Design a protein around this ligand. Structure first.
Ligand SMILES: *[C@@H]1O[C@H](CO)[C@H](O)[C@H](O[C@@H]2O[C@H](CO)[C@@H](O[C@@H]3O[C@H](CS(=O)(=O)O)[C@H](O)[C@H](O[C@H]4O[C@H](CO[C@H]5O[C@H](CO)[C@@H](O)[C@H](O)[C@@H]5O)[C@@H](O)[C@H](O[C@H]5O[C@H](CO)[C@@H](O)[C@H](O)[C@@H]5O)[C@@H]4O)[C@H]3O[C@@H]3O[C@H]([C@H](O)CO)[C@H](O)[C@H](O)[C@H]3O)[C@H](O)[C@H]2O)[C@H]1O
Ligand SMILES: *[C@@H]1O[C@H](CO)[C@H](O)[C@H](O[C@@H]2O[C@H](CO)[C@@H](O[C@@H]3O[C@H](CS(=O)(=O)O)[C@H](O)[C@H](O[C@H]4O[C@H](CO[C@H]5O[C@H](CO)[C@@H](O)[C@H](O)[C@@H]5O)[C@@H](O)[C@H](O[C@H]5O[C@H](CO)[C@@H](O)[C@H](O)[C@@H]5O)[C@@H]4O)[C@H]3O[C@@H]3O[C@H]([C@H](O)CO)[C@H](O)[C@H](O)[C@H]3O)[C@H](O)[C@H]2O)[C@H]1O
Ligand SMILES: *[C@@H]1O[C@H](CO)[C@H](O)[C@H](O[C@@H]2O[C@H](CO)[C@@H](O[C@@H]3O[C@H](CS(=O)(=O)O)[C@H](O)[C@H](O[C@H]4O[C@H](CO[C@H]5O[C@H](CO)[C@@H](O)[C@H](O)[C@@H]5O)[C@@H](O)[C@H](O[C@H]5O[C@H](CO)[C@@H](O)[C@H](O)[C@@H]5O)[C@@H]4O)[C@H]3O[C@@H]3O[C@H]([C@H](O)CO)[C@H](O)[C@H](O)[C@H]3O)[C@H](O)[C@H]2O)[C@H]1O
Ligand SMILES: *[C@@H]1O[C@H](CO)[C@H](O)[C@H](O[C@@H]2O[C@H](CO)[C@@H](O[C@@H]3O[C@H](CS(=O)(=O)O)[C@H](O)[C@H](O[C@H]4O[C@H](CO[C@H]5O[C@H](CO)[C@@H](O)[C@H](O)[C@@H]5O)[C@@H](O)[C@H](O[C@H]5O[C@H](CO)[C@@H](O)[C@H](O)[C@@H]5O)[C@@H]4O)[C@H]3O[C@@H]3O[C@H]([C@H](O)CO)[C@H](O)[C@H](O)[C@H]3O)[C@H](O)[C@H]2O)[C@H]1O
Lengths: 135, 135, 135, 135
């Protein structure tokens, strides 16, 4: 009798270990994707505007998917921080897509202590910095 | 009579062995998880401040989850040693999340014998070193 | 008596499981081989002929092992689709081996609607495309 | 009586099988180690001498741990075949360690039929070839 019953108990234990292992593996098999992007970007800064002109990019991406951050100044548009939003890009505009041939104008404001030589900005896509004016 | 009674005793013993084995296995089936993280980090050190600028990361993580340690100097903030805490990160601040585009300034103090060339620091997340200024 | 007999039955069952497992593994341990090839190839297309000139290759291979496919035109030789066959390569010919210094001429025919600008072709070896005129 | 006695016999058999298995495993769990080495080496050969100049190495190793073999010629030193030995390296010599900046001169002899164009040699460390003059 007993060697067969002991075998049935060990099969029952084996299934629970396998089910446990499957939940451990689930912590590895997610959140990996191709996030690399690369663009030819040029820029000019003034007391009122930042100009951004794109010459080429690795892929064509929406101007709403790009986040812009700034230091030494402030945006004149206050709703948020996507490139499409601060640049005033309408959905019909040519500049709705970030690719070679797209140009943007961002309006900015300086305090009494701030100066043009102190201003810099960065463009971020999928958590990677794709441009930095102070490089 | 006796061969059946001996069989009943062996079943009773078998259950206690199986119950014992289950408690042995419990020492293996815990504390395994995916703790790997990887970031593009750059840094500059001065007699008053450490600057830390992040360009990309493997995942988006809270600045309170990262621990910072220092040698050759001391922090001007004394409450603890999380990155959010020593850098003075408010909960509304852009720099509340550690990702590309996040920048931090940490204020520090040197003794009469300490010098800038002697200072170094490390960032630790889930018990792994993710950055070391002296690498 | 019975604990020994139960043990003999469990050995008999164990052998059949092991024999079963061996037949499962046989579905993995076949059909893996090094099929990569790479060649410097140049080509010119006309209303009557395709010219193919080889400058180098990763290995020396038989012209009968290479398959050619065409669109926008048709071959003047109708027996099949190996490179040796459609190019009229005799077994004594220098061009029997695909390597640097081997040249081939393939004769072709166009319909009333087909034109030279529409023609393209590919070379295939061991199920991989090694050249494509429209790349 | 008998089901308990049969159980005691099966425990005695189980221990001998486990002890047998332990001796099988001992044939796998030995003789695995990191034996890889890699060096920038340059060499020049003449009718009387081989010159060997080292520019870099993966690790710093003793010149007595390296074995040299030769064809088309013979060594003027006859005691053995370690690099330190045939090159006449004293224990105080700079060239006692194989690293960037170490240079060696090995004296050789040719027969009436042998010629400089026929000579070649190899350096061997832990059973791997680390340099071969005829590569
Ligand atoms: C992506 O693609 C899109 C689409 O192609 C854009 O090209 C985007 O780049 C943006 O382009 C816009 C348009 O040029 C830029 O916005 C302008 O900034 C200029 C200053 S500039 O020096 O001339 O170059 C102007 O301020 C312009 O606005 C005009 O409108 C102002 C407000 O007028 C509005 O309201 C009145 C009622 O009060 C209405 O009657 C009127 O119809 C209009 O709706 C005027 O004040 C302004 O006059 C003066 O402006 C400046 C001083 O600020 C001065 O320098 C000028 O010489 C001029 O004398 C001018 O007439 C801005 O355009 C937007 O206009 C809207 C308005 O709602 C109409 O849509 C807003 O009200 C803002 O005024 C402004 O956003 C933008 O900066 C670029 O990013 C590409 O990136
Ligand atoms: C993450 O994101 C967050 C949010 O964006 C941060 O950006 C963080 O980086 C931190 O930024 C802060 C803010 O800049 C840094 O803190 C400052 O260090 C500077 C020195 S610096 O050379 O100017 O760059 C200043 O010390 C600044 O403080 C100011 O406040 C001091 C104290 O004033 C306070 O108390 C008085 C009453 O005594 C109040 O009236 C006043 O309103 C204020 O509450 C001033 O002494 C100081 O003057 C002088 O300071 C230095 C000398 O130390 C000198 O170099 C300057 O030129 C100036 O003459 C200045 O006015 C610091 O900011 C914090 O201020 C708080 C205060 O409670 C207000 O919140 C503290 O009291 C500390 O003073 C200080 O923490 C910080 O180092 C960065 O980590 C990103 O990582
Ligand atoms: C790999 O290596 C091999 C070996 O080196 C090859 O080099 C291969 O490349 C191939 O080369 C051959 C040989 O050049 C190419 O085939 C020829 O195409 C030309 C046209 S071209 O403009 O001159 O360049 C010719 O058509 C040539 O054929 C000749 O033969 C024709 C038929 O004659 C045969 O039959 C008669 C009986 O009717 C016999 O008397 C005769 O001896 C022969 O057996 C002739 O019609 C032809 O005359 C005219 O041809 C063309 C018009 O089509 C015209 O442009 C010419 O100016 C000329 O006036 C010419 O005399 C082709 O060669 C092959 O010949 C065989 C024949 O059986 C002998 O072997 C076939 O009958 C075909 O005619 C033809 O396949 C080939 O295209 C290349 O792939 C390398 O890749
Ligand atoms: C690692 O690091 C070590 C330490 O730095 C070495 O540098 C090693 O490289 C070796 O260097 C040695 C030293 O240079 C090389 O050995 C020499 O080969 C030269 C030939 S060469 O063309 O000049 O370059 C010499 O043969 C030299 O020997 C001299 O000694 C000979 C023997 O003299 C000995 O015995 C007499 C008694 O008979 C004593 O009086 C004397 O003091 C000495 O002990 C001489 O014959 C020789 O004269 C002529 O030699 C050659 C012809 O063979 C000729 O070309 C010359 O122009 C010269 O006229 C010369 O004076 C070799 O050095 C070693 O000397 C020992 C001796 O015991 C002293 O230690 C041996 O007897 C051998 O003679 C010889 O091994 C070696 O080849 C390099 O590997 C780095 O790899």
């Amino acid at each position: 009798v007993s060697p067969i019953i002991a075998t049935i108990l060990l099969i029952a234990i084996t299934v629970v270990l396998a089910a446990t292992l499957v939940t451990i593996l689930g912590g590895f098999t997610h959140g990996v994707s191709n996030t690399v992007e690369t663009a030819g970007v040029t820029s000019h800064i003034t007391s009122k505007y930042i100009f951004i002109n794109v010459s080429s990019s690795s892929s064509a991406i929406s101007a709403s998917s790009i986040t812009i951050t700034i230091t030494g100044a402030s945006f004149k548009v206050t709703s948020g921080d996507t490139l499409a939003e601060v640049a005033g890009v309408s959905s019909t505009s040519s500049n709705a897509t970030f690719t070679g041939g797209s140009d943007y104008t961002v309006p900015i404001s300086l305090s009494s202590s701030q100066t043009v030589a102190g201003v810099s900005f960065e463009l971020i896509y999928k958590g990677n910095v794709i441009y930095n004016s102070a490089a």
